[PDB]
Amino acid sequence: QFTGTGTGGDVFKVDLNEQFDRADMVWIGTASVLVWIMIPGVGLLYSGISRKKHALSLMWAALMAACVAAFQWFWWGYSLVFAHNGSVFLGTLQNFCLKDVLGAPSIVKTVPDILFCLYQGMFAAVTAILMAGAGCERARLGPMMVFLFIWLTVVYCPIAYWTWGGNGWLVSLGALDFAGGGPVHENSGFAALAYSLWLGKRHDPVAKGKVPKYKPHSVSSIVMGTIFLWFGWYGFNGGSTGNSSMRSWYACVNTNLAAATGGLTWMLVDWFRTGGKWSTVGLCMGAIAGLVGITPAAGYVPVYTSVIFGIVPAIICNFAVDLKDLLQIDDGMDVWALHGVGGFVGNFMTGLFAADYVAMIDGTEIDGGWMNHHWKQLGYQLAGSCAVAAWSFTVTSIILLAMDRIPFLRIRLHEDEEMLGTDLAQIGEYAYYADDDPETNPYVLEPIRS
Amino acid sequence: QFTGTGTGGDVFKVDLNEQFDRADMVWIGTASVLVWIMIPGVGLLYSGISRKKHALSLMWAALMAACVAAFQWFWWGYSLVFAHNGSVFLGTLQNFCLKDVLGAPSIVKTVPDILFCLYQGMFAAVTAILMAGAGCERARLGPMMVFLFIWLTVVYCPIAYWTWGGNGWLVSLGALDFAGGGPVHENSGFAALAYSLWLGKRHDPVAKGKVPKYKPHSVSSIVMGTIFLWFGWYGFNGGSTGNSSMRSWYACVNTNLAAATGGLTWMLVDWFRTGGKWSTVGLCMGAIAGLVGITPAAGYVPVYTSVIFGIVPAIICNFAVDLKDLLQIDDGMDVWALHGVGGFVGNFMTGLFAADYVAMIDGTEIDGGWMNHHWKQLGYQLAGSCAVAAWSFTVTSIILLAMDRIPFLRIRLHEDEEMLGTDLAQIGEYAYYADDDPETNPYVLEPIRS
Amino acid sequence: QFTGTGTGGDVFKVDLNEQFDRADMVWIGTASVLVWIMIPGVGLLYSGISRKKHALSLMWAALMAACVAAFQWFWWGYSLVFAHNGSVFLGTLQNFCLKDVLGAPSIVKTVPDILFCLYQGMFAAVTAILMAGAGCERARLGPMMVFLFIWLTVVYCPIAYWTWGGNGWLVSLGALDFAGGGPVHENSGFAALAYSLWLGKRHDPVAKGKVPKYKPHSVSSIVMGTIFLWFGWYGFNGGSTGNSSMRSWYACVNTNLAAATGGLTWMLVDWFRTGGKWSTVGLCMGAIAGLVGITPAAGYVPVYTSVIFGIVPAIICNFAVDLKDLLQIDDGMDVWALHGVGGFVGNFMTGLFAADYVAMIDGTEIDGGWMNHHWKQLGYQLAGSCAVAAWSFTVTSIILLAMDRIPFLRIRLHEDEEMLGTDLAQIGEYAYYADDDPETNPYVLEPIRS
């Protein structure tokens, strides 16, 4: 018999696959593979956009993040989000090292635990490289890897549990978050802001007003990142139905249209604000703003409203990027502006435009948003957004400051203890610091103490 | 009940998904995602092959084209091709802003309208970047975006309707075009030729005989473009069955073999013509020539004949590229040679090698080509090819010349009104023109009037 | 009726697709497309890692290999592995030019011949670029293409037959090889070693001890290669079930975890051995070592053991790379170390950790390994590994030395007959040798005789 718990049954006695539609499984398997390539997509995007020379290559750091996140997820991340037996705030260690993760129907009943594990693990990894990218400036790699492991454990996993978990309190409340805009984008964005405000370079010369808003390290990297992100986002959003229904393809149409209108909107805004220039970076940032914006909404809103999920996040995020000038901080702030602000805005607008008849395309039951005169929905969205932002900002701050107090865990060295790469390159043991060309340097040019 | 029209039925009363095989839908969903990455594939290919420094980066322009095409398709492109109620030449605005596009079976009855919309929208976008690439030299971006919107509307959509539309006159005639070689490749190719002959630089120093046939801007971009194109072409051709049958995988085998033999053929032709050199660009152009060649044929011809769809387009396109020397025009001509000539040749040969027993692999009924002694088939193919070439060349010419007469819509400035980037870089307001390195320049170095 | 042989039946009388689960077919179709992009993944990886300037760009050579392998596979490669009527060592020419390859159930009964042909053809192509990459230094292209065709025919196809063929003697013996670690990785690795020992540069200045272990040509190429390889490996391993069951997704979870732990392990080993440096190349090589390691095991071992398939191959391969210093040979040795040694180690450990209850997830019956007290399994694995290594090393040696004796087939010129690119660039007919920048050079800078 099928037990519905643990491994789901004895494989020598039952065929666990009989519980699931095979095409549902194939689409979520494919969607998993698509989300995986978003991981280097993030790295390429933020490597390319940077107005500063990062010692750590974020294209490469994306592979590091893929490794650390996969291990964390296996170790206990999956279990802390999707153990079928948690509180309303967190799971348990019931599935430590993926013990008994096999063929029981997952919280998404149309796929087995092992496949939901594969799929959702990719979301954790995308969030990991968002966070690594946000905090990469003058990062020490050892501490960064420890930080990512800890951060996934006590920031990502709780927020993911609230959003996706069987007893997650946001689920119970009635908040909507179609493809995990909260755990991935809003979360990483406000964690990025914690990094900016505590560890980021202040009075940063690249952020002092009379300097260009856009000054990319590599436009080709921006474009390649945006390509991988848009391509992969079809799995990110399209797979968030958990099935092969046409709500999946509907979500993909919304995804494409939000990206498209976001890109054009941001570029048009830049055109107006610059007095007629065509912004290469702006088009890409706008596509990302729309992809982020539509993430909580893609399987819930009517197709024609998806254009609003491009336009409004593009406009608001474009102006949010200007805050870097007020603060005179660059580090971490792009991730905050696109993912934190974009995620907040998209989540809010999901309360306005969610429609029960869109969810019903595959039989999913929701009360809907303002499209259905369900006025309360907007309050549920705000509650989710504020909770995510509060937890992510506060707990990320605590982790960063706690690690800072520990010499061998300090992620970013204090400027009074930091050795100059110019001077390191003169010391014999550190002569390899003379090659700050990450295209040929075999070693990360890690900050060194005195 | 299932209505077969409009949304296809009331989602609160019926499950629209019951009409479709879930695995059919998953493959066409996946194929959609694969065709999307062909869009930057085109941009990379034509950016890399260029013998001239384009101010507009085509890798980046591919994302711009993805945005413009997605919006056009949503706005009315989809409706003009696939409204279930058009003439024999064009659709209607019944599905303006994708109104009522949901779960009715599409013209391809094995998938719902919303999924066919997703899939076919990708073909429009691939064609958009082919056209943007063809017309990119000294292009002004604002006018280019307007041009693409207009061109998709009155050149792409009619030709697509004739080919795929429920009452399309090419369909009724009996012409074969498996994966839309007409609307995508032959169309963009002869539109490219219109660009070359009216707007392209004449007496072009890079096309004056004593200069190299191959002189690529970036071989790595050529190769990356070819990679994305070949990878994505499995969705382009493999999804054109509309189903999960083994005719889909048969089409993929044909696709791979045509690419392979095209690449080797073009490189061998170059080897003979150069007296023993191995042409890096030639291998890539040959793979594209074979992919284009097999596009109208992939689900119709026996596997062993797919090698002819590599060899013959490779040879003919290789010599077509030489016409650039006779004309002394470079701009737009590569797109014409590969897609216009390749598409024409492939469409012609489909009349020779189409077999009813190949179509019958998934129950598709055709009379076949010369393989079945259906001699008339070749005439149907020629009719389609000539109609596509005539409409695309003529109407593209009219659009380009009409926009040229309008100062704020002129796509390419006349040489007497065009400001020198060298001189712009001296004027204070235009000092950013001094950085013509598109890897770090945040702005398109758009042509400026006097 | 369904015949089970030849084309599988008359398409005008029966629907051949009725024999197969459509979702099984869609996943293997998708997996085919994913394995295809591993081909340029290999090229990028070995182009980037190189401590030497290769005249042949391996990114480009990957497309050449895709062409040659697809043609060989069509011509007779498929038939020599999967003709339903061979010996215990090789197939026949029954499916020459894919004659009668259509809808009969393949050796993997859940998919038709034409789809298994598509899928398995990709494995041949991945192996082809591994071999081209291994033997690329100072290679002449014409001879290289002939070599690849011959090598696929008499080295790859026999080993593939033993592993996958209906009567393959390794299958009969009881050896386990889930995703073809033998035919692809161990095979190419020991073929690479044959290249190193017979044709590779000896007393190579880059391999003389006092020089860096890691000195990459292009870290961005390494990372992009690793991205394409890890992404594609989900199809490589995940599709090796032949079905849409959750054993496919289980294999993907193992694949991701082995890559992740391999990357971290190799980087940590480098950290210890260098006294605290963070190795950019090492992380990537470790992910590949884990992907190779888990390949024979992914659908057979419990998830928690997949971490061992990252850790142990990473450690052993890391030290295997040191052999380059002892031998003072660089050419071919990276492919041997990762794929030859990694493949050998993974195959061995599959005998330890294979579990009948993992195979049983989709009803697959195996005796298992030491996890099931099936002690004999380790001996079966060793037999397979030694047979593959012996055949590949010996026959590759014979091919290389035989071609060397034939002036127009010699793959690498002898140093006494080899012309200097510096001196070629002075001879008028060879002036194009002055541009050794493969990013703009339209021609392969092939070695020229005196």
UniProtKB/TrEMBL annotation, chains A, B, C:
UniProt keyword list: Ammonia transport, Membrane, Transmembrane, Transmembrane helix, Transport
Major localization listed first in the record, in broad terms: membrane
Top-rank taxon: Eukaryota
Transmembrane segments: 25-46, 58-76, 113-134, 146-164, 170-198, 219-236, 248-269, 281-298, 304-323, 335-360, 380-403
All copies of domain Ammonium transporter AmtB-like, residue ranges: 26-432
Molecular functions per Gene Ontology: ammonium channel activity
Compartment(s) where it occurs, according to its Swiss-Prot or TrEMBL record: Cell membrane; Membrane
One Pfam family here: Ammonium_transp
Keyword tRNA processing in record: no
Signal sequence, renumbered to the chain: none
Topology within the bilayer: Multi-pass membrane protein
GO biological process terms held by the UniProt record: ammonium transmembrane transport; cellular response to nitrogen starvation; cellular response to starvation; filamentous growth; filamentous growth of a population of unicellular organisms in response to starvation; nitrogen utilization; positive regulation of filamentous growth of a population of unicellular organisms; pseudohyphal growth
GO CC list: plasma membrane
Gene3D superfamilies, per the entry: Ammonium transporter AmtB like domains (1.10.3430.10)
Family affiliation: Belongs to the ammonia transporter channel (TC 1.A.11.2) family.
Protein's recorded name: Ammonium transporter
Organism: Candida albicans (strain SC5314 / ATCC MYA-2876) (Yeast)
